[PDB]
Amino acid sequence: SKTPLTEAVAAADSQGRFLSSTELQVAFGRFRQAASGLAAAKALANNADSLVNGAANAVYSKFPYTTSTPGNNFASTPEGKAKCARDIGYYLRIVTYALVAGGTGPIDEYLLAGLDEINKTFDLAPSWYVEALKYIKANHGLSGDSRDEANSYIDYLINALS
Amino acid sequence: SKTPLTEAVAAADSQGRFLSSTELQVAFGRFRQAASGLAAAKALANNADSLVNGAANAVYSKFPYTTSTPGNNFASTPEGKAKCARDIGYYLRIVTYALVAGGTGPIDEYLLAGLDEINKTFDLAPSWYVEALKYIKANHGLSGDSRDEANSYIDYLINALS
Amino acid sequence: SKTPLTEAVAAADSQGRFLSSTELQVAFGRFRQAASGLAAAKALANNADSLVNGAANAVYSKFPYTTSTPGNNFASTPEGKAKCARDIGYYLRIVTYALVAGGTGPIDEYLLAGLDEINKTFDLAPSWYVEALKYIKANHGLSGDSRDEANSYIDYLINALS
Amino acid sequence: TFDAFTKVVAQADARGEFLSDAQLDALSRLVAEGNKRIDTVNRITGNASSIVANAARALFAEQPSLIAPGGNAYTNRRMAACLRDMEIILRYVTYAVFTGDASILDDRCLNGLRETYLALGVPGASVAEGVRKMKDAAVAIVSDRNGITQGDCSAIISELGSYFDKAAAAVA
Amino acid sequence: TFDAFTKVVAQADARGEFLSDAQLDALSRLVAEGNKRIDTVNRITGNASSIVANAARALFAEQPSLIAPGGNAYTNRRMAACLRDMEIILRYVTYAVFTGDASILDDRCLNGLRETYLALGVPGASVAEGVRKMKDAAVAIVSDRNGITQGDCSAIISELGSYFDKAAAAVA
Amino acid sequence: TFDAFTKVVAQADARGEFLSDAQLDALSRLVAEGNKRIDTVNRITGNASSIVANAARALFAEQPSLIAPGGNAYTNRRMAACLRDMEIILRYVTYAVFTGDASILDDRCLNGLRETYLALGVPGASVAEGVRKMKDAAVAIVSDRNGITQGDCSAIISELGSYFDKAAAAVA
Numbered sequence A, B, C: 001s002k003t004p005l006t007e008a009v010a011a012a013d014s015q016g017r018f019l020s021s022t023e024l025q026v027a028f029g030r031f032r033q034a035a036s037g038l039a040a041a042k043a044l045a046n047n048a049d050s051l052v053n054g055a056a057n058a059v060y061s062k063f064p065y066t067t068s069t070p071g072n073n074f075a076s077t078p079e080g081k082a083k084c085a086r087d088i089g090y091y092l093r094i095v096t097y098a099l100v101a102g103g104t105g106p107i108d109e110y111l112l113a114g115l116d117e118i119n120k121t122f123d124l125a126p127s128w129y130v131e132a133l134k135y136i137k138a139n140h141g142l143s144g145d146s147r148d149e150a151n152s153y154i155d156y157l158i159n160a161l162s
Numbered sequence D, E, F: 001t002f003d004a005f006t007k008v009v010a011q012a013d014a015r016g017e018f019l020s021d022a023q024l025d026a027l028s029r030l031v032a033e034g035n036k037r038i039d040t041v042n043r044i045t046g047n048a049s050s051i052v053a054n055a056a057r058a059l060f061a062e063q064p065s066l067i068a069p070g071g072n073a074y075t076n077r078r079m080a081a082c083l084r085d086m087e088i089i090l091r092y093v094t095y096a097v098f099t100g101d102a103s104i105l106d107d108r109c110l111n112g113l114r115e116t117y118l119a120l121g122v123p124g125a126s127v128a129e130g131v132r133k134m135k136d137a138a139v140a141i142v143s144d145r146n147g148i149t150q151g152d153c154s155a156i157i158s159e160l161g162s163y164f165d166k167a168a169a170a171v172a
């Protein structure tokens, strides 16, 4: 899936060429970025329960109809609340994978491909996930390159959901 | 092979689509037609001997050189007359299949594909078959929708031989 | 590989056609040529030691650095001289195959495909082989059609090395 | 592929025969019942999305390990593919009802599917269960007396069931 | 594909040897007989349609079940395929004569053919008989003394025969 | 294909888990050693031609039957194909060093190479030997102390070796 390292090799492979200074520079930028990626992943991981239940609560508060309307797609039963917290958990965990990879690869592969189809078939509102994501962004407390990279993936998903 | 039902499904299948009112109307069309088609198939089967022998004889009168000239392609011998009657029977039977199917499909599959090659290689005059088909058209005695559908197949073959 | 006979059949086959006067003319042209082509192949073969030894010595004389400069690509050792005489024999032998075939096919298949790559990888100078081929052209003692056909193969190689 | 008419034609041509009166009359009966065939197709088609979605939901509720991480329906790409398969199978089932012959379904859909699944590690037995769930849903919709001229659809419902059964048996 | 000349070249190259004097002399004798080879190809080519049609006609007379409804040659499409096969084999036989090597016929025509016939249920023994009839017709045409310079064509006729027999065995 | 990072990601996603500290720390060390990885790639790349040329020459020296007429490396087309495969394998080995995972090399280069060689009669044991020579040359080039900041490259050298070993075993 898409990361600086796999993209550089795919380019060289498709040209039948050895790696050159161009791809070496890609590797340099990857390794400049990676420590803050790993640290961002580590922090989000350690703060998972707070972030997921916080995000869940921000969706339910933004859209109170979701906890009070009967339906398979709604969070009006314990089952539905559990489905929703699970889902938010998936978004967050797969964001950490993007930070680990240094690319959208894990997102594209595990979450984004098929997302529209899923949201449509199960009647899940994109705006619910947008809200959960805005909460994670507002509340992860990351700084510097960690922030910047983590927010690029979060906004990547908000963009994909609108 | 080509029928209303197979054509409708091939269209839908090619579009990757469920059938819709369009194809249901195809089927309504098929079922309005089919009773008169099946009646025509029954009538032509019951009258096969007379239609075949009558058709053979009409070819022999129109083209008397075919029964007086020696050669593998002609009907100057008992074997030759028998190949001729057999062929006309094939035309007639396969027309009844088109009436059963409600389409040219059986004609297309069992008779028309390779027809020019066979007529050419074996030196059979297309005008011989034309005459035999004109005779069946003029003598099957069918009326209304039975006549119209059956004539469409006979003319289809006449057009293919000219 | 490319000979009058294979070319003619491939042309016919690609068009799905029987051979016609065009290809028989190709055959007549082939058989007109082959007597002198076979004779030339026989002469070159019987003269091979003389041609190959003389060609190598012509090359060493034209390019004395090849016998005095140490290097894997040079003929400064017995092994290097042996490689060189070997290669020249290959060129001569494969020219005889083109005379046998009546076309460039044996040259194209056994010697010319990959030629540039070999000369590049092993740092062999095209000009060395040009000189060897020039010596062969000057000293084969052929005349008439034998000479002309042989000279076309030798010149075809010189062209490919330039 | 064949429709019900060309299937009988193929049998006759191989034997060099006109259809018998018996064969023509069997086709007449099929034609006289055509409206019920058309209603069957339309009824499933009108409900296709909910048939797929409800069956899928029920499948995952009884086999949660399909959607747990590492399961074959986990990740949205795998889920969307699974949902698509269910929709494809239902689609081809309606084409078989429409034409009155299994060949569209067997030739264009089920042929080679067992192998496809085995190569991908798709659990064919779980697909089959998904198909049986759609079967029961679809049969109940086609069977429903509300909103249609009353009559006996037992033959066409049984023929419908037979196409679903072919699908279930092909994927396992 | 090889012709007679490049066939001998291939062998020589693999041994890293010039063609021997005798090898060259053998090719010299093929060259000296070249007009006979050309006449052989032209003669068969000139009579290709009737060689095919006459062989086919005799085959079907001897094997009526091929053309009875349900038979392997029954229906214009299957008959057309059958004639085409006979023509293709004759065509490739002429190419083999023209080139003085079987490779064109083996590589482009005969390889896979047995297997193709088995997949489709074409009766190979019947195709082989058809080929043998074309062989007999073609040999008589080539051997005819009328309207040609007289001489001895037994070697080219035997070579021609051998390509037909190779083709026949590949399917029989 | 995976890189070192997405490889570990895939292992964690299959269990529905965040990377563990062991996993994160292992990737941290890899990151900290990154300049060495880049130097390893650059150094092999910078010497590609002479690594191929010299291993090829030594191979033919020890195995003269490969270059004798009728040998597998005889004729310029086969010699070119042989030099090309050497360069291909070296190229794919450098990709594996770059991504830190064998998958680019296994999935795109080695998978089905043995079978390729068997069909053509390429002697895989000789290929393997050529690879081993390239390995020895590549290792000495990467380990060379001249013109580089000094330090310990034993981990990257060991990883590099492991990829060469995969290449030689895939055809041996």
Ligand SMILES: *[C@@H](C)[C@H]1/C(=C/c2[nH]c(/C=C3N=C(/C=C4\NC(=O)C(CC)=C4C)C(C)=C\3CCC(=O)O)c(CCC(=O)O)c2C)NC(=O)[C@@H]1C
Residues within 6 Å of the ligand: B021, B024, B025, D032, D033, D034, D035, D036, D037, D038, D039, D040, D042, D142, D143, D144, D145, D148, D149, D150, D151, D152, D153, D156
């Ligand atoms: C078993 C499937 C159920 C059932 C079916 C049933 N249908 C009819 C009759 C008709 N159905 C139609 C359908 C359509 N008309 C349209 O214009 C369209 C849209 C393109 C459709 C789908 C038609 C035209 C008829 C005929 C008129 C009528 O309403 O009767 C019957 C009656 C008998 C017959 O075959 O005609 C039946 C039984 N009925 C049930 O009770 C089953 C649950």
Ligand SMILES: *[C@@H](C)[C@H]1/C(=C/c2[nH]c(/C=C3N=C(/C=C4\NC(=O)C(CC)=C4C)C(C)=C\3CCC(=O)O)c(CCC(=O)O)c2C)NC(=O)[C@@H]1C
Residues within 6 Å of the ligand: C021, C024, C025, E032, E033, E034, E035, E036, E037, E038, E039, E040, E042, E142, E143, E144, E145, E148, E149, E150, E151, E152, E153, E156
């Ligand atoms: C065995 C096949 C029969 C046979 C052949 C035969 N042919 C020749 C000689 C020639 N045949 C040709 C042919 C052509 N000239 C053209 O322009 C064309 C049209 C493109 C053709 C096909 C030629 C040019 C010759 C040479 C001149 C001549 O007329 O002799 C011979 C004679 C020996 C030889 O090889 O030249 C023979 C024997 N003869 C038979 O009796 C066989 C039944």
Ligand SMILES: *[C@@H](C)[C@H]1/C(=C/c2[nH]c(/C=C3N=C(/C=C4\NC(=O)C(CC)=C4C)C(C)=C\3CCC(=O)O)c(CCC(=O)O)c2C)NC(=O)[C@@H]1C
Residues within 6 Å of the ligand: A021, A024, A025, F032, F033, F034, F035, F036, F037, F038, F039, F040, F042, F142, F143, F144, F145, F148, F149, F150, F151, F152, F153, F156
């Ligand atoms: C084992 C492979 C050998 C080795 C490697 C080694 N390299 C470094 C450090 C660096 N190497 C580079 C590389 C490049 N700079 C560029 O601009 C390019 C071209 C695009 C290249 C290839 C860089 C930037 C560094 C950092 C600066 C520096 O020189 O230190 C080290 C030092 C430790 C580290 O990981 O940084 C080492 C050990 N050294 C050996 O002795 C082995 C034979």
Ligand SMILES: *[C@H](C)[C@H]1/C(=C/c2[nH]c(/C=C3N=C(/C=C4\NC(=O)C(CC)=C4C)C(C)=C\3CCC(=O)O)c(CCC(=O)O)c2C)NC(=O)[C@@H]1C
Residues within 6 Å of the ligand: A059, A060, A066, A067, A072, A073, A074, A075, A076, A079, A080, A081, A083, A084, A085, A087, A088, A090, A091, A110, A111, A118, A122, A124, A128, A129, A132, D057, D060, D067, D073, D074, D075, D076, D079
């Ligand atoms: C929470 C924001 C809201 C909510 C959630 C909700 N989701 C579902 C069901 C599903 N959610 C997913 C999502 C994923 N599956 C994956 O594999 C991935 C990537 C790893 C994701 C993001 C899927 C596929 C489903 C459907 C299948 C399943 O049950 O797993 C439900 C249940 C819907 C149903 O019909 O069963 C609910 C309730 N609903 C709300 O009201 C919240 C505000």
Ligand SMILES: *[C@H](C)[C@H]1/C(=C/c2[nH]c(/C=C3N=C(/C=C4\NC(=O)C(CC)=C4C)C(C)=C\3CCC(=O)O)c(CCC(=O)O)c2C)NC(=O)[C@@H]1C
Residues within 6 Å of the ligand: B059, B060, B066, B067, B072, B073, B074, B075, B076, B080, B081, B083, B084, B085, B087, B088, B090, B091, B110, B111, B118, B122, B124, B128, B129, B132, E057, E060, E067, E073, E074, E075, E076, E079
């Ligand atoms: C009758 C109108 C005239 C006539 C007939 C005649 N036909 C043949 C030979 C063939 N006819 C067919 C036709 C078909 N075979 C099929 O499979 C189908 C579709 C189901 C058809 C229409 C074929 C293929 C043949 C050749 C093979 C065979 O013998 O079956 C002959 C014999 C010709 C010969 O050379 O053997 C004849 C005499 N000839 C007339 O003069 C009549 C006026």
Ligand SMILES: *[C@H](C)[C@H]1/C(=C/c2[nH]c(/C=C3N=C(/C=C4\NC(=O)C(CC)=C4C)C(C)=C\3CCC(=O)O)c(CCC(=O)O)c2C)NC(=O)[C@@H]1C
Residues within 6 Å of the ligand: D066, D071, D072, D073, D077, D078, D079, D081, D082, D083, D085, D086, D088, D089, D108, D109, D110, D113, D116, D120, D122, D123, D126, D127, D130
């Ligand atoms: C859902 C009930 C189950 C499930 C399904 C699943 N299927 C695939 C992948 C494929 N399914 C097909 C099937 C078809 N393709 C067609 O076009 C047709 C005929 C028109 C059929 C019937 C194919 C070809 C594939 C492979 C290619 C593709 O992805 O489209 C997957 C994806 C598997 C993967 O790992 O890539 C899945 C998940 N999985 C479950 O767990 C359910 C039991």
Ligand SMILES: *[C@H](C)[C@H]1/C(=C/c2[nH]c(/C=C3N=C(/C=C4\NC(=O)C(CC)=C4C)C(C)=C\3CCC(=O)O)c(CCC(=O)O)c2C)NC(=O)[C@@H]1C
Residues within 6 Å of the ligand: E066, E071, E072, E073, E078, E079, E081, E082, E083, E085, E086, E088, E108, E109, E110, E113, E116, E120, E122, E123, E126, E127, E130
């Ligand atoms: C006639 C003597 C016999 C006969 C023949 C028959 N053959 C086929 C089908 C095929 N034959 C071929 C052969 C080739 N195709 C090529 O292009 C080449 C090389 C250039 C060859 C030699 C092929 C490929 C097929 C299949 C594809 C096609 O139909 O074109 C048939 C049709 C079988 C069917 O069921 O469709 C038939 C009838 N059959 C007899 O009974 C005779 C003994």
Ligand SMILES: *[C@H](C)[C@H]1/C(=C/c2[nH]c(/C=C3N=C(/C=C4\NC(=O)C(CC)=C4C)C(C)=C\3CCC(=O)O)c(CCC(=O)O)c2C)NC(=O)[C@@H]1C
Residues within 6 Å of the ligand: C059, C060, C066, C067, C072, C073, C074, C075, C076, C079, C080, C081, C083, C084, C085, C087, C088, C090, C091, C110, C111, C118, C122, C124, C128, C129, C132, F057, F060, F067, F073, F074, F075, F076, F079
């Ligand atoms: C003589 C003109 C000069 C010369 C020769 C020289 N050649 C090599 C090595 C090779 N020569 C070839 C060429 C061919 N091999 C083939 O298969 C064919 C076609 C059939 C040809 C023409 C090849 C492939 C090589 C390399 C592999 C091998 O050794 O066989 C060498 C040795 C090269 C080395 O680096 O080991 C030499 C010395 N050098 C001169 O100075 C002469 C003037």
Ligand SMILES: *[C@H](C)[C@H]1/C(=C/c2[nH]c(/C=C3N=C(/C=C4\NC(=O)C(CC)=C4C)C(C)=C\3CCC(=O)O)c(CCC(=O)O)c2C)NC(=O)[C@@H]1C
Residues within 6 Å of the ligand: F066, F071, F072, F073, F078, F079, F081, F082, F083, F085, F086, F088, F108, F109, F110, F113, F116, F120, F122, F123, F126, F127, F130
């Ligand atoms: C040299 C050390 C040895 C040798 C090699 C040799 N290889 C071939 C042919 C092929 N090699 C490959 C392999 C690859 N091609 C790719 O694209 C990839 C992955 C990206 C690989 C690993 C292939 C596909 C072929 C076959 C098709 C082709 O020629 O390209 C040959 C040619 C054999 C022939 O007879 O045609 C040779 C000679 N031969 C030796 O003797 C050495 C031990």
